[PDB]
Write a protein that binds this ligand. Structure first.
Ligand SMILES: CCCCSC[C@H]1CN(Cc2c[nH]c3c(N)ncnc23)C[C@@H]1O
Ligand SMILES: CCCCSC[C@H]1CN(Cc2c[nH]c3c(N)ncnc23)C[C@@H]1O
Ligand SMILES: [Cl-]
Ligand SMILES: [Cl-]
Lengths: 232, 232
């Protein structure tokens, strides 16, 4: 009747397929703004699941729709990412403590890379949700890292860009949607958690690795997300 | 009572200051999602004016809010841009026939630059609004070009990037918001017009030129936008 409403996002269909299957409930499909929102009831929560499509514009739009049109009270993102640090290996999980838009460049006006006037380089996520993930991971004896995630509108697959992301932002992983999702949530005062499982190492072999591990890594993230929702 | 609702967007405050002044009516300030929406009544139309803040995430969010929360029926963007072609000089106006996100790169998977799965490289704008602009420009004896506008999250100020935009996309101008605004409008079936006045030539001197001409070029675009609204 007055159930908590939880938005759950992936970027690609492959990132939400395992989520829908794992919850195992019926969903109503609601189209809006070129996205399909799957609305169901799971453990006395209304869960709204969608894939945004790839990149920052897609993810910004879908997040905004989820908040303004569906009234979600928290947003959890689940999907895959490229690893930027040697201690994050294929299949490993992390939650973003902060996000950055790594491809923003207003250096022509002496702004630091990632910075836009009237905004900030780094976007924060929900301490409470991140602490819940840490609690669950320890109880399940699963490793879970915390760190900075870099988002941009390029698939990163070069040693040079990888090193830039580490040197400039101290990022632990790279993807194409988290910062936009967290940014929108922040603007609307909605708690946000960005969870990723490593699919590749963001180098010259990344396309290969991503193709090999998308399905498995997406499933690993999906399983963990469900375990979080179970305690919300 | 049942007036047409028109959304009007700039990216920076400087792009909307002349718009608000030129309409010359009282506006109610309504904050939402970190933007301020100026709502007024002008010639029996409800006009909703806002600056998005710079770049693709900001502009996507503001456009989505304008449509979902304010119910606007058309969106007109007005502001400044860098020229990519010698026949577009400082202060000259153009309307975007199509827009592209010039910084999107999924070439690791052999996708063409600008392309994202389940989307398209080029986003269309409103033929009807573009034709209105052309009609007015001819009646006012003002030059008005039509062409492709490239949008990305970098201020472009190098000969190399400028040449890339021309060779890859046949773009006539560069900015940081038009494609995201047009993209959102398209997804919601809302007619969109992107109008820009040249502030710089998108080369190594662009920062200088932009600083010099922002105010004047913004005013030129604002004046033209008002002339369009007068005939809506
Ligand atoms: C199907 C063809 C296009 C695939 S583009 C990659 C997907 C997976 N997402 C995360 C992602 C994993 N590895 C990455 C990397 N190396 N760089 C940047 N993002 C990532 C972002 C985007 O939604
Ligand atoms: C105040 C410091 C930051 C200014 S960033 C430039 C503004 C003006 N907009 C259009 C614009 C004109 N010239 C351009 C160029 N050469 N490259 C890309 N965009 C442009 C985009 C953005 O909203
Ligand atoms: Cl069910
Ligand atoms: Cl008035």
């Amino acid at each position: 009747e007055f159930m908590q409403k939880i938005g759950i996002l992936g970027a690609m269909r492959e990132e939400i397929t395992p989520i829908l299957e794992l919850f195992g409930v019926d969903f109503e499909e609601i189209p809006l703004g070129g996205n399909v929102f799957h609305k169901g009831v799971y453990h006395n929560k209304e869960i709204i699941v969608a894939y945004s499509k790839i990149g920052k514009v897609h993810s910004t739009l879908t997040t905004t729709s989820m908040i303004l049109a569906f009234g979600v009270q928290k947003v959890l993102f689940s999907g895959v990412a490229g690893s930027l640090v040697k201690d994050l290996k294929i299949n490993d999980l992390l939650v973003a403590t902060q996000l950055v838009q790594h491809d923003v460049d207003l250096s022509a006006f002496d702004h630091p890379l990632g910075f836009i006037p009237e905004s900030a380089i780094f976007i924060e996520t929900s301490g409470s949700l991140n602490a819940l993930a840490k609690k669950i991971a320890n109880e399940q004896h699963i490793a879970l890292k915390e760190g900075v995630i870099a988002s941009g509108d390029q698939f990163v697959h070069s040693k040079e860009r990888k090193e830039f992301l580490v040197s400039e932002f101290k990022a632990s992983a790279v993807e194409m949607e988290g910062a936009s999702v967290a940014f929108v949530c922040q603007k609307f005062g909605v708690p946000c958690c960005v969870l990723r499982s490593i699919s590749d190492n963001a180098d010259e072999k990344a396309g290969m690795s991503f193709d090999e591990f998308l399905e498995k890594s997406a499933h690993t993230s999906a399983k963990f997300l469900k375990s979080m929702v179970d305690e919300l």
